From a paper:
Here we show that a dominant member of the human microbiota, Bacteroides ovatus, contains a GH115 enzyme, BoAgu115A, which displays glucuronoxylan α-(4-O-methyl)-glucuronidase activity. The enzyme is significantly more active against substrates in which the xylose decorated with GlcA/MeGlcA is flanked by one or more xylose residues.
The crystal structure of the native BoAgu115A was solved by extending the phase information from an initial selenomethionine SAD at 3.0 Å to a native resolution of 2.65 Å, whereas the ligand structure of the enzyme was determined by molecular replacement at a resolution of 2.14 Å. Arg-328 (and Glu-375) in the apo structure, however, are too distant from the hub of the active site to play a direct role in enzyme function. Thus, for the arginine to contribute to substrate binding the loop containing this amino acid (and Asp-332) would be required to undergo a conformational change.
Numbering used by the authors:
A (entry chain B): 32 to 330, 340 to 381, 384 to 853
B (entry chain A): 33 to 854
């Protein structure tokens, strides 16, 4: 299926040789659609080789590219002379055959020859040649650059994508304010989508091998905003439709814009105007391949069957042809689905719908499977509705989309697949997976699934970047699948179990890995990578840290712990950084080409809809007078252990001329506590910790971690006592053996001081307090002792380099 | 702070819109001051873009004047007023910077720097440069000089006072392979010539130090190039030698002539040694150099065997006699040092003493902790005390040659101590190859100057001022946060000592520390890409690389630990972790390759080539960085099923892929969908166009024998009632007991009762959780088998949680429980 090589070879056609492209010939009996594709091919080749190939007016070159459509007299007298059999394109749908051939017609020696089964086959073939040459369908829509080549050669043999398994394959631009609309404003100057915009949309669709579009309908009217809209799609080869709730080829806004004049949307009071409304739409779309939405809602099963009948009679009257000859779609959404369980005319495409969240609701049984008109599926990657919007980023696991669409195809649904793509961006990858599956759902299985994004990343970022990029794409997709950014908040994950820490840290790890890849990019890929990997990863990693930080702020605040203050700072930074990321995306990235494409509000949802005016700061509490909020900690032992950071003491008594001092960051974990200054004696000085232990425990082992200070004042060493109030003390010398004497030097000395701490264990007795509360007092007996951590082991301590996670506390 | 970058009245014009102003040094000044001024000239050039003139005589309107207290010219400036002699007379290494009107004949107004001695004057000149934007680290760390249109000098008198420590210096040590091979590449010499030593010296004086122990592993400072001493001496730097290099001879001077000489044994070869000693003192005449007395044993070792206090006394008594013979003066007039390093401390303990005048150099443990400090009586020892501090070390229990590993807090907490106990004559820090200890050096030198500038409360303002100076005000706070934290992390354990067993794997501590460093990396990359391009090189040198190299090194070892744990269980997931080791190994090389070859244009090739992966013992005596041992499961795709879970903490969380046994229905397969769901993957019977009748999937677990009842949570993909109005059903149960059926999606539709209470809430989250209570059968095994049976097509099973009292509502349904397979 790969027919382009970038190095010369025998019995291969020199399309581009040593920087010189052969010309292009399109016979003039070819639809305007082919001439466009061919003009784009011409520019695509200019992109790859540097020199513009000439669009021939006649058969005036020895080697060239020819592209044509089956059924032409010219193509017939080429297929005939010769070799290419008729059966291979006769009555085939949207197929092409691409084949190097001598000697195609008199004035020519040899040519690469693309022949379509119909115009879209021919267009699809042209773009295949263009894509295998390195022009990604996303060269404009995602700034993917064109890998330059001095030599392009085409393999011998016959090359096809066959027939598309799904008859109509398209996208729906929807939920398009404010992002898409304000982008279109910035780019085109228009308060609607005009033909310049839709040319861009149609080309993407076609280059993706797609063939269908539901144009934007929230505030615009495709048919009525610009006479050239229809003319543009129809001449290029894109079939227009309208959404399930816009019957008879009228755009919903055509009615709304004139609500006051036309009156109610109700068939039992305003039938005549509505019939005329329907009628004018069917007239407007004559001579396009457009598909017609039937049915009606709002403002009995009998009433509806009668609307359809009338709609069909209106179709018959305008077309002067039986209804069955106008493509029609009827949607099974809401009540109309219940009704179905209802007389539906044989020829109509019956359109099923997903649950708005990527899971299919209902599929046809074997009896329904043989409904002549076929079945369609309406699938979502964006959504405005319950339980909360998903308007912001891509939230679709590659696996989900895959799993539900192979199911859909397998249950016979193969007439029409339409994907709600929001603002188009940032759904570039899921769009592509949708089109490729729509072409052939049986080209995929569990084994090879991830090859598709691998190809995608190879195509978007060069082969050397493909694997790493694909890994990041697949993961970020999966992470975003867990919870949308709109429904993410401080409660989504479990703080207590370290779940929230694990998912925050993991997303930041991915951010790290995406930045590695990003700075390793040849600069002409930086934009496409930011758009398709870097930004979604950065934006959501940052969001996750924000709510993580919000969660920590609340837990800590309720614990009267002033560490809440730092977590508040963090919330504010992430909130700032969120706006910072999108400003880069709108104004800086790609020269600000995509201004307004990333302005969707997502922080401040207290509801299903984005009712709130702007992105707003998530509630944070600050502890007043942190400097003075020290001491008072009480720990609650759990899982057989109490890990305590020196600083979280209950009460403390200093020696005269000393102040117990917090040395932040000191040691392996939180901080160090030390009597200061070091010149004064430590007599009478103590520091205490309040804990709850299960009652009955009478003997515990306590680990005391101190900075590995050496015997600097006195050859004996440093000593301290550790003990329970109401129990016997133990006095420990921790550094007497820590010196260069032969029996200490490599046995105990250096192995200790390299690792900067001294840990000693004490087997202490615990008094029988009736409420389980205990107080452990530590007394430094010599100067310059820095206490870092205590661990009360009562059966659960597990030897850990940082001496286990700090236990539950409050002040 | 006296330098502003915008004009104003009553201020002094130093740079007007790209125009500097001349400098004038009276030719009566030490050559070292001409050198400093020489550099100031080049600094201004860098600041605006035009080089100021070095005036022959006092002949200008607006110029800089620098000088030293005592010259006839200076006295005839200070009297021209209004400056008191007391301010500088008898003062040590102090300066006065005061704009003065009508300073002498020919000069209208001039910025005047007057030092109390030559070094004073120099530090004054370098204070001007530093304040103008010339960072001491402008060459040594590629720190840009912020371009300035205008530059002006506030009025009033300015000083740093006298320094609190007399001698403040560095020891270049453990200098191979990095420093050595870099010097080669840079200077073209296989030894340190005066050109290398000029750069070293300049840095020291700019940092406000004054002392140096030169590299001595394979070089000989004094012999290699006759200009070495002359440069240091003439620039203002005082030279000394290490604790095993007595009497002004570099140890290699002995090694090079070892056969010719005798053997480093004073009791049997006194004559040849006495002469060696003598030649050193002869040679350092005319210099401020400090002389090492005492004697260890021929390298980093003891003379000899065990403490011999009587003998070393003769060594000393004799050395001091040589000093007088050479100097024809009393010994007490030649600066001397006795260093109590390693074993030499038992000497002082066994009671050895030296004359009142020698500097008693006390020592840290080679790892940042001070060994001893004077008591009350001892602090009264007239020669004074000193401290030999380490930020790099070759020796026990393993080398630390690679990266900065000193937490900011440690250096500070130990040095505030040292100072409080009146150790205030000499501080020297072992800096390894100088790079990458740029930070700790500066903290050392700044503390050295003025230790009571620092307290626990404002400590962190020092690396802040550091980062501002190096990266620009707007990146200070963040850069400082990263500097502090990375220093701290590295304190936990050295690169050399870190290995797969450092952290606890089972508890998730390993995971924790690995993620935290990549978080840090992530944060530093952010800051990096946000920088104006002139700072990129510095920031890489000072922050980025230390962080990346280490974060990567932590991940390599974490992956190793995960690889072995998983390989033990026969879990093919071990292959992924294996790939991850090889990948981070390669990345370690890529990072140092960049540092050596790409960054700063390759200015620092070989400064970052230390071996750090593959230490078996204390020393780096192994061929090269070598890949940690990893294990692979052969035939991974066939290594499925067989899993047995063991409960803990009152739960068993099973990822669905990890089954014990399965049986498919006719013309279906049980199929793994990697990444499917919230966690690991999903199991589904495929294709979905077949009935699931007779299909099942089983899990083998170990509960405590006395658990009668459990609640199992079954998590499937939120598949909807697509085929059958009744919806989808499965059953879950123990072999030996009854199956329990569950209909998971009947309530998931648009009916009024369901639509907004349960339907949309559930589907937007892509999963369905249902719980069943189960009776635990009594088994002979103590083991139970729990069987899931899909009853409708298209059910994807994601996870199971067997809960016997420990389960905690979690979005990901808790970290998977402990397993092994076969
Ligand atoms: Na959007
Ligand atoms: Na080194």
């Amino acid at each position: 299926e790969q027919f382009v090589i970038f190095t010369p070879a025998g019995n291969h056609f020199p399309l581009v040789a040593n920087g010189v492209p052969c010309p292009i010939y399109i016979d003039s009996s070819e639809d305007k659609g082919v001439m466009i594709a061919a003009g784009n091919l011409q520019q695509d080749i200019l992109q790859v080789c540097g020199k513009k190939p000439e669009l021939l007016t006649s058969t005036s070159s020895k080697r060239c590219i020819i592209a044509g459509t089956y059924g032409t007299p010219f193509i017939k007298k080429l297929m005939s002379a010769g070799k290419i059999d008729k059966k291979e394109l006769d009555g085939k749908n949207e197929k092409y055959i691409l084949q190097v051939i001598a000697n195609p017609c008199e004035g020519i020696d040899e040519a690469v020859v693309i022949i379509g089964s119909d115009r879209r086959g021919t267009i699809y073939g042209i773009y295949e040649l263009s894509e295998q040459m390195g022009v990604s369908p996303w060269y404009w829509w995602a700034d993917v650059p064109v890998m330059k080549q001095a030599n392009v050669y085409i393999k011998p043999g016959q090359y096809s994508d066959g027939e598309p398994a799904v008859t109509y394959r398209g996208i729906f631009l929807n939920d398009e304010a404010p992002c898409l609309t304000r982008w279109v404003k910035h780019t085109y100057g228009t308060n609607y989508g005009d033909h310049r915009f839709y040319a861009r949309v149609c080309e993407l669709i076609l280059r993706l091998k797609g063939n269908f579009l539901w144009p934007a309908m929230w505030s615009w009217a495709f048919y009525a905003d610009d006479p050239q809209n229809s003319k543009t799609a129809s001449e290029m080869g894109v079939i227009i439709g309208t959404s399930h709730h816009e019957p008879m080829a009228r755009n919903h806004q055509e009615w709304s814009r004139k609500r006051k004049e036309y009156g109610a949307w109700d068939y039992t009071t305003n039938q005549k105007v509505i019939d005329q409304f329907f009628r004018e739409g069917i007239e407007r779309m004559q001579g396009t391949e457009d598909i017609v939405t039937i049915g009606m809602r709002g403002d009995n099963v009998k009433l509806l069957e009668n609307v359809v009948k009338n709609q069909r009679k209106i179709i018959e009257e305008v077309t002067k042809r039986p209804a069955k000859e106008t493509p029609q779609v009827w949607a099974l959404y809401k009540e109309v689905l219940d009704y179905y369980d209802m007389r539906v005319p044989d020829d109509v495409i019956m359109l099923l719908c997903d649950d708005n969240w990527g899971n299919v609701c209902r599929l046809p049984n074997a009896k329904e499977r043989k409904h002549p008109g076929g079945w369609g599926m309406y699938y979502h990657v964006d959504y405005v509705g319950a339980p909360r919007n998903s308007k912001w980023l891509n939230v679709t696991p590659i696996q989900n989309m895959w799993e539900q669409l192979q199911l859909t195809y397998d249950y016979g649904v193969e007439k029409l697949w339409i994907l709600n793509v929001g603002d188009l961006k940032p759904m570039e990858y899921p769009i592509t997976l949708f089109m490729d599956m729509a072409w052939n759902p049986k080209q995929f299985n569990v084994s090879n699934l991830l090859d598709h994004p691998r190809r995608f990343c190879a195509q978007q970022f060069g082969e050397d970047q493909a694997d790493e990029a694909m890994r990041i794409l697949n993961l970020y997709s999966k992470y975003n699948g867990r919870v949308t950014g709109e429904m993410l908040d401080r409660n989504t994950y479990n703080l207590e179990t370290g779940e929230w820490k694990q998912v925050s840290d993991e997303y930041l790890k991915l951010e790290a890995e995406a930045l590695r890849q990003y700075i390793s990019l040849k600069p002409e890929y930086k934009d496409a990578y930011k758009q398709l990997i870097l930004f979604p990863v950065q934006a959501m990693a940052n969001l996750y840290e924000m709510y993580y930080a919000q969660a920590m702020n609340h837990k800590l605040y309720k614990e009267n712990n002033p560490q809440a203050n730092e977590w508040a700072d963090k919330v504010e930074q992430a909130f700032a950084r969120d706006k910072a990321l999108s400003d880069d995306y709108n104004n800086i990235m790609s020269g600000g080409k995509w201004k307004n494409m990333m302005i969707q509000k997502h922080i401040g949802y207290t509801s299903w809809n984005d009712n709130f005016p702007a992105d707003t700061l998530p509630k944070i509490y600050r502890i007043e007078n942190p400097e003075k909020a020290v001491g008072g900690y009480v720990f609650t032992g759990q899982d057989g252990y109490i890990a305590i950071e020196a600083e979280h003491y209950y009460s403390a008594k200093a020696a005269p001329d000393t102040e117990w001092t917090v040395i932040p960051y000191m040691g392996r974990t939180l901080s160090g506590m030390a009597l200061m200054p070091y010149t004064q004696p430590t007599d009478g000085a103590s520091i205490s910790y309040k804990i709850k232990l299960p009652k009955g425990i009478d003997k515990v082992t306590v680990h005391v971690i101190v900075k590995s200070t050496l015997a600097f004042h006195d050859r004996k060493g440093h000593e301290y006592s550790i003990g329970f109030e109401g129990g016997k003390d133990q006095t420990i010398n921790f550094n007497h053996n820590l010196n260069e004497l032969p029996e200490n030097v490599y046995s105990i000395y250096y192995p200790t001081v390299a690792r900067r701490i001294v840990e000693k264990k004490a087997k202490l007795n615990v008094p029988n307090t009736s409420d389980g509360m205990q107080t452990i007092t530590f007394k430094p007996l010599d100067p310059g002792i820095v206490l870092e951590k205590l661990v009360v082991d009562y059966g659960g301590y597990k030897k850990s380099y940082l001496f286990m996670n700090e236990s539950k506390s409050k002040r």
